[PDB]
Unconditional design. Structure first.
Lengths: 542, 12, 279, 253
């Protein structure tokens, strides 16, 4: 019985012995404050005051985000760590049935126990929970293409009529999870139906540390982890890792440590009592495991590694100036708080080595998020598919507070050929509108785009999208050739001497470009390493 | 690209 | 139940008597080490230690490669020599149906036995295996495929929700084979769903020698193979051959000999070098 | 008010974000154009038979037209305000673009008073000078929709911004605009300092030095305000002395 003193409810929902360190979900910390204030705060105050304010409780919750982040974990923990009736779990398309009027009945049967208990008792009914998984499967926008059978509308209408209708009900809480909130109906996301909506993003570095400490907890307290494992270093090494890949990393390290004793296969499959009572996972296991789990958000970093497979030979002095300018621009975008969009153009003669310089700058920048768009990735697709790919890639870059994008060979992304001239207007317009849209509030971008047909871009009237130019002239003197040959190991010192001496006599205003020079050296290494072959090739190519 | 429902009659 | 018990599992999952030399697959040695280390390594150690480490087992295995190079063979051998339950085979698009809502009910019926046995015997359950064949036929990227009635999205969502959902399973192992890995959905390859991905490729010279050795075995011990046949030379002449082509070569030479003999000369039947060279 | 957000008022925020850089009255022509816009708003509010008034705002690129139009729109206080810009239509197909434009125009005939703002008319039709290439269907849709009167006792004010006056002249689309406004670039070096005080770039002595140097070596000044602000922002963090600012200014001019 409630005494005179205003003491908390008898059968509370959250109880007073609760703290966010007991759930077991690491990383997200502000989201939990928001969720636990908006929804589970009006069910703890004594019923009298909550009745004197004339407000009803919120009856909906939506969680959305990328794949492998923690949505279902939150749903599970919320469902089975409260004081309420058991959840009525429903998978994605687990509602549909074959007969004419059985799908809607399946959606109606979820609410009946709650209705009965609310009718019988009133405001003392225990909380009920039902959780919809993969919400974006059946509940799509009404009147859209698809669902030729008349099922896409009846289901949505039934759910709308049963969540806020002519008969009231305020002892339920329905929770839904999805990867795409742009397809859920528009009448399902208004106050009274799915009020609180929360986005769950990739973890921060300190978030990665928290997740790592959460996963390796039973391992540490049973004395099964070595003393040379430093979790901060592991958080540092993992860049594009989501919550669901740290688990894979830990379990791969455990497999490496296990496999030494019972060597599956071979003849060493015999378990020895001594060495399984002294098991210990060490640092080398984690470092080896780092080679198994490959993050899915960091594929482009491998292509930016491939781009520079030829190495940055610091011949000449102009290279250092270009790299310094790139570093300056990266620093400016990092520090300034008003410049939220910086775009560059890197133009020069064909074969001069632009993509390599752009890739080098981007790699040495050290940003969390780096991507690259190239003709290779778009081969064979159709126009609509290409536009869709470009739009998706540009949309993925609007999260996080620091971003870098490398657009390669602009003139060949629009199918240019000078006979007509022919080209694609749609792709050109899409890029022209994409390179001037500021990202959301509190974000920054740095777009570096290379080209080799400066004049064509001038004619199209697209030279206003960019902000600053960087020219890359090709080698002209004859000492640069000597430096390249020294760093390529073509001949002995004497050989370089003879080749340069002879070339002096039959080569005025030497002008080739590095990409061709390296190929000529490579092919000349077989036929006649003496002067003749290299001189002939460099004369015929210049 | 078509689908179908189904109805049912009782016994005579 | 539990306590400190440093003794092997009650009903081990692999066997007391096993060795790669008798599996029947030749030319792939590194791949098998990787597979058996990552998948079947945590199912052999005593349950007490695995419980202490706070680990869960791997619930997927995808393996891909060009045509006719030994993928279905591995899927068959794994599912028949592991003291596990009877495999649940679904070959091709064998689930689609023409009644609304009955297409995915076939995907939810493959897991019923595993759930039923897990709910009763928690961690003493036997291993259940289900083999998906031609995985790329139905489980394409959701939202990109051409318009229709919306059955592709429902199938993909049903499998996604059943493989890793709000109710946990620790008995299931699911295997998938395909020739075009690019078409598979992006969310099915996340760790925890299809964690271990392996590639099977054309063999090199030693691989070709091993395949030849394990194909012509029952005709080498029955004393039905001549003494002038040398498998090293044959492994050297056949270049860029696959496993299926070597099997075809063997049975073609056998047919040559059998057709040649054609009353009771069958007692002396013997395959010779000339038959192999004509094949 | 930071937790609940409207669902229909999702386009006034974009208008509010177009004038984020802030308005500075570096001269008096700005006041005159704003007063003219306010006068037109008053006329459309008080009249009865003038149910449709259309304006054109034209000038050299980079002179800040969209911000000025958004500023006029936001100070009106009308119940209904909406904006169409290339950002909304990006990625759609031709039919989708036409449908979207038609629906937005049909949604402006409900409330008693309305304001509609069209941004960068030339880029809405995909104009590129190589061909010339452009989309005829969207042009005809817009041309038909800018002359249709709304139903009885409903008033609409349309403001469209363009930067290719000559191109519009060539298409012969110039008969469906009632009045025109021009926004010339800043041309007096003093105006630069008028902006400078508003931005607090450098000290007063530095301002005197920069203006004197540019007057020495910068006749016929022509920059545009957007470029000037970008240059000042760049010069804040690299080198406070004049060198960087003077170099950038003489480069743009
Ligand atoms: N914040 C986190 N803290 C701890 N573990 C996490 C976290 N996020 C994810 N995990 C790990 O990821 C595993 C699987 O993640 P989860 O079940 O949340 O997938 P999901 O986000 O629903 O993915 P999908 O889009 O495929 O449905 C969880 O069992 C947990 O091990
Ligand atoms: N600054 C540089 N110093 C040394 N080697 C360089 C440099 N820039 C590029 N290279 C070499 O150039 C080769 C790659 O050429 P790259 O792709 O950059 O040429 P490109 O001019 O961008 O090509 P395209 O003709 O397709 O426009 C690699 O060998 C790379 O090492
Ligand atoms: N590595 C191998 N060692 C021995 N025999 C092999 C090997 N690979 C293939 N074979 C032979 O190939 C026969 C058929 O190969 P299998 O059915 O496994 O090919 P597959 O990769 O599934 O083909 P597909 O892509 O056409 O479906 C097997 O019965 C076996 O005889
Ligand atoms: N009178 C003004 N005084 C100060 N700042 C202004 C003034 N007018 C506009 N601005 C600011 O300068 C920029 C105006 O340029 P904006 O891009 O909006 O116009 P535009 O000329 O139509 O552009 P575009 O270059 O795309 O053709 C915005 O930052 C705006 O805040």
């Amino acid at each position: 019985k409630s005494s005179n003193s205003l003491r908390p409810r008898s059968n509370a929902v959250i109880r007073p012995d609760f703290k966010f360190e007991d759930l077991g979900v690491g990383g997200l910390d502000k989201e939990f404050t928001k969720i636990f204030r908006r929804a589970f705060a009006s069910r703890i105050f004594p019923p009298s005051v909550i009745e004197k304010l004339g407000i009803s409780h919120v009856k909906g919750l939506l969680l959305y985000g990328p794949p492998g982040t923690g949505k279902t974990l939150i749903a599970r923990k919320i469902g089975t760590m409260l004081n309420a009736k058991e959840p009525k779990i429903v998978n994605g398309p687990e509602i549909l049935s074959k007969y004419v009027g059985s799908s809607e009945e399946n959606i109606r049967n979820l609410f009946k126990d709650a209705e009965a208990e609310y009718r019988a008792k009133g405001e003392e009914s225990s909380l009920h929970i039902i959780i919809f998984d993969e919400l974006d499967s059946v509940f799509k926008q009404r009147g859209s293409r698809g669902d030729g059978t008349g099922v896409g509308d009846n289901v949505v209408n039934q759910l709308l009529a049963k969540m806020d209708g002519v008969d009231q009900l305020n002892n339920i809480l329905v929770i839904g999870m999805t990867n795409r909130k742009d397809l859920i109906d528009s009448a399902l996301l208004r106050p009274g139906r799915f009020e609180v909506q929360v986005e769950i993003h990739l973890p921060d570095e300190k978030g990665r540390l928290q997740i790592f400490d959460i996963q390796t907890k039973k391992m540490r307290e049973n004395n099964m982890m070595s003393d040379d494992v430093n979790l901060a270093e592991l958080a540092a090494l993992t860049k594009n890792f989501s919550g669901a890949e740290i688990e894979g990393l830990v379990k791969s390290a455990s497999s490496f440590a296990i496999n030494k004793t019972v060597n599956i296969g071979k003849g060493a499959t015999k378990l020895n009592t001594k060495d399984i009572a002294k098991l210990k996972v060490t640092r080398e296991d984690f470092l080896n495991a780092l080679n198994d789990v490959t993050p899915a958000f960091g594929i482009s970093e491998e292509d930016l590694k491939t781009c520079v497979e030829g190495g940055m030979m610091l011949y000449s002095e102009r290279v250092n100036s270009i790299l310094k300018n790139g570093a300056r621009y990266v620093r400016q975008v990092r520090e300034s708080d008003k410049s939220r969009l910086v775009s560059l153009l890197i133009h020069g003669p064909a074969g001069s080595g632009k993509t390599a310089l752009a890739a080098e700058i981007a790699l040495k920048s050290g940003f969390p998020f780096i991507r690259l768009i190239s003709p290779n990735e778009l081969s064979g697709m159709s126009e609509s598919a290409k536009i869709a790919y470009i739009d998706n890639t540009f949309r993925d870059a609007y999260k996080s507070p620091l971003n870098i994008l490398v657009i390669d060979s602009l003139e060949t992304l629009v199918d240019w050929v000078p006979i007509g001239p022919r080209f694609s207007n749609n792709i050109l317009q899409m890029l022209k509108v994409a390179l001037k849209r500021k990202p959301p509030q509190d974000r920054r971008l740095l777009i570096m785009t290379t080209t080799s047909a400066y004049s064509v871009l001038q004619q199209m009237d697209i030279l206003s999208c960019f902000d600053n130019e960087i020219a890359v002239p090709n080698m002209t003197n004859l000492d640069e050739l000597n430096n390249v040959m020294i760093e390529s190991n073509f001949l002995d010192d004497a050989g370089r001497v003879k080749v340069i001496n002879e070339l002096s006599r039959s080569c005025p205003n030497f002008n080739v470009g590095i990409k061709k020079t390296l190929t000529n050296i490579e092919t000349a290494r077989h036929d006649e390493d003496p002067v003749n072959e290299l001189v002939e090739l460099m004369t015929q190519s210049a | 690209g078509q689908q179908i429902f189904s109805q049912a009659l009782l016994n005579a």
